[PDB]
Design a protein around this ligand. Sequence first.
Ligand SMILES: *[C@@H]1O[C@H](CO)[C@@H](O)[C@H](O)[C@H]1NC(C)=O
Ligand SMILES: *[C@@H]1O[C@H](CO)[C@H](O)[C@H](O)[C@H]1NC(C)=O
Ligand code: NA
Length: 430
Amino acid sequence: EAFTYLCTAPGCATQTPVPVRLAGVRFESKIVDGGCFAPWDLEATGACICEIPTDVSCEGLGAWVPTAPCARIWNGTQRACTFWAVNAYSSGGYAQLASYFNPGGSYYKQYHPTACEVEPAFGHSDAACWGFPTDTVMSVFALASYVQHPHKTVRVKFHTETRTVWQLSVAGVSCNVTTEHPFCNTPHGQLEVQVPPDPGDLVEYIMNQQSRWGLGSPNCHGPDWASPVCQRHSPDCSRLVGATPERPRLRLVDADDPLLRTAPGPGEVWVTPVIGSQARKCGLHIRAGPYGHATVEMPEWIHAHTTSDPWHPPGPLGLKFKTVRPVALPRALAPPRNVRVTGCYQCGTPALVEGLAPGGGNCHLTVNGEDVGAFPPGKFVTAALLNTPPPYQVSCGGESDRASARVIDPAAQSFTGVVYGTHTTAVSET
Ligand SMILES: *[C@@H]1O[C@H](CO)[C@@H](O)[C@H](O)[C@H]1NC(C)=O
Ligand SMILES: *[C@@H]1O[C@H](CO)[C@H](O)[C@H](O)[C@H]1NC(C)=O
Ligand code: NA
């Protein structure tokens, strides 16, 4: 019997009693694909208008509201928009007098429909709108939503049941040691490798292709609080699920209002008319309180909060050299029969793998090359966490056979057991 320590850095090697070289460090895991993640980005636009527009929409307000921001914010999540009448028509017009601007603006909406809220704002300063010979007219439009920026969207895979893979070369023979499989064959004996514990769960941030690594769940209560994982979750990179901020709170705030001495809260948008340099024109100053009290800068966050490679303990590895040889057990090399795979892959819920193991010894069962355990001949049933999609090639170590599968992807699993969207009901007349 012999013992030596093997360091875990590139170039690390021992020579006695049998040479062992650290060839590399990799990792194995049970992947949980979360889909797409992005920060909650509160974006706002609008316009100060020296008119009472009759169509409160991006197209209807095209003469005042910036085109591209309006269209982008309108299509955003949890949209909020308000149209305020600061100074209405004194006479004439069409549903443009002050009387049409009752709280909630139902009278104006009757003739001028809009998806936006309509409110009176009489008493607010109309100083921004000037150059009217008679009848000063002014209105303010504000539009805000949570926009998903493609440059801030990251694909995230959670790595569970993580196993650091210490790739060794034992006298020229490849041996990959983990906490699950720490044994190696040596010329005339066995090597047992003492390994440090596994690092726990990992977070794989997929940049678009490059992978960046986080260590943990992540912890949304610590320095990684601003992680997109802690924010907007889209399992199929299309539909939103779970926790969502409320619709933004829009306020018309005059330039001299003492409220401006304080900062807006998260999800709050304050709009201030700016006096125009031109007659019958005005600008708009927008103050928005971002979700989580800060705006996430994606390349910068990833650079500081992730590593290029997954983390592993420093080692060293304990090399226990023994003269013992493992007992030769009979192995069945024929493929397994009537294999059925049911459930999901890369989801975190073990899939059901059932079939018939053939004769000749234990079947070292693989599902698309993934080890799912060894089974004695006859009927077998196992719950395995699968990382590969269907079709499933099943083997006992020799020839492979095609299994029957009813396996869904991680996005489909995220929508299984739920009915997505609006819940509609009707109350009939008596
Ligand atoms: C160890 O891992 C490498 C890379 O995946 C592979 O090429 C090699 O065959 C593995 N060795 C054994 C003994 O499984
Ligand atoms: C919707 O809800 C009302 C009560 O609020 C009735 O129960 C109606 O039958 C519901 N609709 C359906 C299809 O069940
Ligand atoms: Na007026």
